[PDB]
Amino acid sequence: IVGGYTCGANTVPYQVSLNSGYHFCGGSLINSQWVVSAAHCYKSGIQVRLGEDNINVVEGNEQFISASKSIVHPSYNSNTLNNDIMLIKLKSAASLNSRVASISLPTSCASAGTQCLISGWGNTKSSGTSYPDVLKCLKAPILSDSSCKSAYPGQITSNMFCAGYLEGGKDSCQGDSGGPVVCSGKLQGIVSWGSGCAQKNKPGVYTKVCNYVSWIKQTIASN
Ligand SMILES: [NH3+][C@H]1C[C@@H]1c1ccccc1
Ligand SMILES: [Ca+2]
């Protein structure tokens, strides 16, 4: 996250870190046994790390649970990033409390102008690199559809939204991939892609989760 603030330990209780020997993607806990992330985060051998603030220090609220199954969306296209969403089932159910909690799925899509919280452990610089060890937060609005398609001509599908600032300086960034965009207590977006980070007129692009709610529900009811 570029131009954000330190969230505070366990203040984003649904945030997960996907680990394959190192943090490589964020994700969101949607119930005690399922995590949703970005399909471009797919990897074999994922351990899900819950209750994290400092991902390099065991601080006492962590739950490390290995993945038993991963399901990439059936129409994921890695060239266009259309339908960049994946579900991960945990080998055992997470123990839920004030610091480890699931986030609600939306019943309605969020409108442009809605303020949202984006969070993750990714790069905090738009120019060069510096990775935080503690969780970073960013409040950003959902941008209008037409400003989103104007910033990314011929690249925005109906399964994407832009969120952020056309002026730049505040954005999600590499390593924030798969992480949550929560608006009014509901998961609305997944950190998906963008042109660099925090660049002028190149806002972050997010997977529009409200389009996938029935595939998610159907899939966890059957797996
Ligand atoms: N414009 C930056 C939000 C987009 C981003 C870049 C790389 C990884 C995740 C998100
Ligand atoms: Ca830790």
> Which positions make up the binding site for substrate?
171-172, 174-175, 177
Q: Is 133 a catalytic residue?
A: no
Distance of CA 207 to the CA centre of its chain: 9
* CA–CA gap between residue 120 and residue 173 (Å, rounded): 9
**Domains within the chain, CATH numbers bracketed:** 1-12+103-210 (2.40.10.10), 13-102+211-223 (2.40.10.10)
Helix (H) or strand (E) holding 148: helix 145-151
Residue 149, CA distances (Å) to 142, 185, 218 in order: 13, 27, 31
**Tokens, residue 42:** 């797919």
Antiparallel, parallel or unpaired: β 86-90 and 63-72: antiparallel
Please, which residues have CB within 8 angstroms of residue 8's CB and are 6 or more apart in sequence?
A: 53
Which residues approach ligand 1 with their CB closer than 6 A? 171-174, 176-177, 191, 193-194, 197, 202, 204
Q: How does DSSP assign 154-196, residue by residue?
A: TT--TTEEEES-TT-S-B--TT-TT-EEEETTEEEEEEEE-SS
Q: What spacing in Å lies between the alpha carbon of 193 and ligand 2's midpoint? A: 26
Ligand 1 atom 3, closest CA: 204
Closest CA to 223 of 60, 77, 46, 87: 87
Q: What spacing in Å lies between the alpha carbon of 39 and ligand 1's midpoint? A: 14
70: Cα within 13 Å, side-chain hemisphere: 19
Closest CA to 209 of 28, 17, 40, 67: 28
Best of 81, 129, 173 for a ligand 1 pocket test (most atoms within 8 Å of beta carbon): 173
* CA–CA gap between residue 95 and residue 17 (Å, rounded): 16
Q: What spacing in Å lies between the alpha carbon of 106 and ligand 1's midpoint? A: 23
Q: Kindly name the residue from 40, 102, 119, 176 that is annotated as catalytic.
A: 40
**What type of residue is 149?**
K
> Which positions make up the binding site for Ca(2+)?
52, 54, 57, 62
> Residue 2 gets which letter from DSSP?
B
* CA–CA gap between residue 34 and residue 123 (Å, rounded): 26
Q: How does DSSP assign 79-112, residue by residue?
A: TTTBT--EEEEESS-----SSS---BPPSSPPPT
Residue 176, CA distances (Å) to 16, 91, 138, 152, 220 in order: 11, 24, 11, 20, 25
What three-state secondary structure class fits 37? strand
Residue 13 has φ and ψ, to the nearest 5°, of -75, -15
* CA–CA gap between residue 44 and residue 47 (Å, rounded): 10
Contact predicate 172/192, CB 8 Å? no
Residue 208 has φ and ψ, to the nearest 5°, of -80, 90
